Amino acid sequence: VVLYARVSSHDRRSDLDRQVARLTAWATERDLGVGQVVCEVGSGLGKRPKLRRILSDPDARVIVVEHRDRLARFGVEHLEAALSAQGRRIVVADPDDLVCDMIEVLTGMCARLYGRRGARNRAMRAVTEAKRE
Amino acid sequence: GVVLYARVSSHDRRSDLDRQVARLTAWATERDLGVGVVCEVGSGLGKRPKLRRILSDPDARVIVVEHRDRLARFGVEHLEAALSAQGRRIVVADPDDLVCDMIEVLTGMCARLYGRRGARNRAMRAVTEAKR
């Protein structure tokens, strides 16, 4: 059983404590041995070698996250599908990086569309225009 | 035991599905390989039951796509990692619906942030400001 915590920037390091706490409360409630309480700083979309190692290890039968979005902002249903085939599963212990994730999405999508030069400045004016209504 | 997989966002792009099936069978015939071509209409992220069925089937050892982004706009490296553990892999035959995916993403992210009411109109002004 792997307990897994994620945060976008090393500014949100206190949310990693709120995650580890809720995750060990989860584990102790079912008096379960924990092999790995894994804390990662990385993109909800960019490389995450701690989660790569966890997903590539067939021994990590149960992967416990606080919310679904900590494992991935997109594609979790597909990861669950791939894991299911190997009798491994993702557990969600409870049913905010989103605005920062809106910028990293738009940056990458702007880079591909109009070139990397100023792609983040484009994404910044865009995240801004999507605030008025 | 090789799955050829083709994806398109809207059933308006059904011509880009022909370009994928063609390139995918050219790929398979070059290595004289038996094919067990899956064509899907769906989100580069939203539900895709054809890919779910493929990923949940352990017999699908090789999953062939035209470009990485046809399997998923995000998270492909993690899918590859999970599959690798079961000796299964994703093959990419070649190294845009992106703008339609930029709206799809910003809508959902706007709906979570400021409420679903007008969330697509917010995403639309945003996808527009990122064009100058």
Author numbering:
A (entry chain A): 52 to 96, 98 to 147, 152 to 189
B (entry chain B): 51 to 86, 88 to 96, 98 to 147, 152 to 188
Q: Can you list sentences taken from the study reporting this PDB entry?
A:
The SRs found in IS607-family transposable elements, however, are distinguished by the location of their DBDs at their N-termini (experimentally confirmed below).
The TnpAISC1926 subunits are shifted apart by about 3 Å relative to TnpAIS1535, the TnpAISC1926 D helices are angled by about 15° rather than being parallel, and the TnpAISC1926 B helices are one turn longer than in TnpAIS1535. The active site serines of each TnpA dimer (TnpAIS1535 residue 59 and TnpAISC1926 residue 74) are separated by 28.6 and 31.5 Å (Cα atoms), respectively. The E helices are interrupted by a four residue β-turn (GRRG in TnpAIS1535 and GMRS in TnpAISC1926) and fold into an antiparallel structure. The split E helices from each subunit associate into a 4-helix bundle, with the C-terminal segments of TnpAIS1535 helix E rotated 35° relative to those of TnpAISC1926. F126C, located just before the start of helix D, and Q138C at the C-terminal end of helix D efficiently formed dimers after oxidation. Within the helix E bundle, L162C generated substantial amounts of covalently-linked dimers and A182C generated a small amount of dimers after oxidation. These solution results substantiate the dimeric structures observed by crystallography. TnpAIS1535 CTD native and Se-met data were both collected to 2.5 Å resolution, and integrated and scaled using XDS.
